[PDB]
Design a binder for these strands. Structure first.
Lengths: 192, 194
DNA sequence: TATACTGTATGCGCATACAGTA
DNA sequence: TATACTGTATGCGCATACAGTA
């Protein structure tokens, strides 16, 4: 049930038209737009999308294309797990650089820089991170958030708190994946 | 140019159909849903809305009815301009209001390490729910002599204390009998992005 | 002429089936 | 049979104009 190259276009094209002109496109509009000389090319490109279950075609209704598949989500506890947990319509282009997901922080390791137990962490899904940055790493399937400081094979993860000590790692006898870069924080306690 | 009652209905019907079926309605659909026996009634009620500039009609395009309809960041504020003194705000970040509890109304750019020990850092965008009913113990955005302050509230009638979550700061004491004091709103959460 | 419509009427607008050709 | 199409037809689905009646 995977989308082809040209089928991805059509579906991306519908999303645009609905988002741009507030209404779904006609077959002839899809053809026109993409370059087909036959509206039937759109028809079958649509019929397929309906079978691969990404759209719903309404019989008779002009512009009767309803999208189906359809804001940054939080993972909760474990860096991405299919397909938990929450769904929150936040601005991704609010952080620098753009956030991809949220992680529910756990513990007071990064206290001294305003990262508290229970915060929602804004993270960028990348692997190129540099020294001194704040990062989400996964030491043996165990997701952790700290300040990075690598030296070849010796990777040091520092906490922002004086009661916590550096977590030293050696990739030669431990698995270690960078989940992403910490770009911002969102707190939503309803505390009294 | 305000809308007539029957025209307010028609506009609400479209608003719904779009939100219920993913696409604008036809003339016949409007006539059907509202009880007209003639789609021309839908046509004119639409043409009227087009004049009143609330919708746009696309010629020839079936269902060619286009409608013509987030949180803000308060600027550090010069004295004598209110909440919300205007143009102070500095921009709008289109977040989720129903994310926080109670629903957040605006963001204030925090200033200082007074609320450090609870994760409120100099330069965080604080989310705020505008209200004047804030209980003691809660965190509030108050205004001592047009001077927006953020702290933990402890009000004892006429003597009002503003408590900071930091050990190097002292509690700010206010006496309403000789200083103005506005509860601007309730601190419902924090947002950091720089 | 301006709202609020019922009724009738054209006719492009559009969805959609039945052919090809790669 | 499944993509990707070009081409042709068949008709309703639709916007809209032209009267009427309150």
């Amino acid at each position: 049930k995977a989308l082809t190259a040209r089928q991805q276009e059509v579906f991306d094209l519908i999303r645009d038209h609905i988002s741009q002109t507030g209404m779904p496109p006609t077959r002839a509009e899809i053809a026109q737009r993409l370059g087909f000389r036959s509206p039937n090319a759109a028809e079958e490109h649509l019929k397929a999308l309906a079978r691969k279950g990404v759209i719903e075609i309404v019989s008779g209704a002009s512009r009767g294309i309803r999208l189906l598949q359809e804001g940054l989500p939080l993972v909760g506890r474990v860096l991405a797990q299919q397909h938990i947990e929450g769904h929150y319509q936040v601005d991704p282009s609010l952080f620098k650089p753009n956030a991809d997901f949220l992680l529910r922080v756990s513990g007071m390791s990064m206290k001294d820089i305003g990262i508290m137990d229970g915060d929602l962490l804004a993270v960028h899904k990348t692997q190129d991170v540099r020294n001194g940055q704040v990062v989400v790493a996964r030491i043996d399937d165990e997701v952790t958030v700290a300040r990075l400081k690598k030296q070849g094979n010796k990777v040091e993860l520092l906490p922002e708190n004086s009661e916590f000590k550096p977590i030293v790692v050696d990739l030669r006898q431990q698995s270690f994946t960078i989940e992403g870069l910490a770009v911002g924080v969102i707190r939503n306690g309803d505390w009294l």
